């Protein structure tokens, strides 16, 4: 259809959730409507590494350098790791073979794509199919972002 929206409340805090990926039109024409959104939640497929990851990295690069998103914070979720651990053996991460090395290399090759390091931060996470601590991570990141913005506005930071 169009844009899909969801509500959920956590720790007496209100959360608007905007799914927009189904628009299927020119992103640059309407992307500016979302200036001022507190956080951007990105999702990266790990098991789709052999190249889909080049496309995913290019898409990530574009979002960081958009002019509207100069000061917005990025929350990154790395999914499909349960299959990734087994896929390393069949397809090495070069396409020091290990789970930790591949995870660190992926994390570094993404996190090294924001020039204005001082302006914004890139929270990073590893998510599995089943985990109840994801919402706690979102809460603990959003509160930090809010505090940083309030401090920067008054000149204290």
């Amino acid at each position: 259809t169009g844009i899909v929206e969801t509500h959920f409340t956590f720790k007496d805090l209100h959360f608007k959730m905007f799914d927009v990926g189904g628009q299927r039109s020119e992103r640059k024409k309407w992307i500016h409507c979302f200036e001022g959104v507190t956080a951007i939640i990105f999702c990266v497929a790990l098991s789709d590494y052999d190249n889909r990851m080049h496309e995913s990295m290019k898409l990530f690069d574009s979002i960081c350098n958009n002019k509207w998103f100069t000061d917005t914070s990025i929350i990154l979720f790395l999914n499909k790791k349960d299959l990734f651990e087994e896929k390393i053996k069949k397809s090495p991460l070069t396409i020091s073979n290990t789970y930790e090395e591949a995870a660190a290399y992926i994390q570094c090759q993404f996190e090294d794509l924001n020039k204005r390091k001082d302006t914004k931060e890139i929270y990073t996470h590893f998510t599995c199919a089943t985990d109840t601590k994801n919402v706690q991570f979102v809460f603990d990141a959003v509160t930090d972002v809010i505090i940083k913005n309030n401090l920067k506005d008054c000149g204290l930071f």
Binding site: F15, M17, F18, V37, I40, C43, A45, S56, V138, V142
Partner: protein
């Protein structure tokens, strides 16, 4: 300004009070945009 203007300004004041209350309430919601590539497990993340 006969009673017509008085009624108009009273109604305008009620509208402005309602708008201010709604905006103050709605300034507390935390908005989160979702992005990624297709078939990247976004449905599982949302669920």
């Amino acid at each position: 300004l006969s009673a017509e203007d008085k009624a108009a300004v009273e109604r305008s004041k009620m509208i402005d009070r309602n708008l201010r209350e709604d905006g103050e309430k709605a300034a507390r919601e935390v908005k989160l945009l979702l992005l990624g590539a297709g078939e990247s497990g976004k449905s599982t993340i949302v669920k």
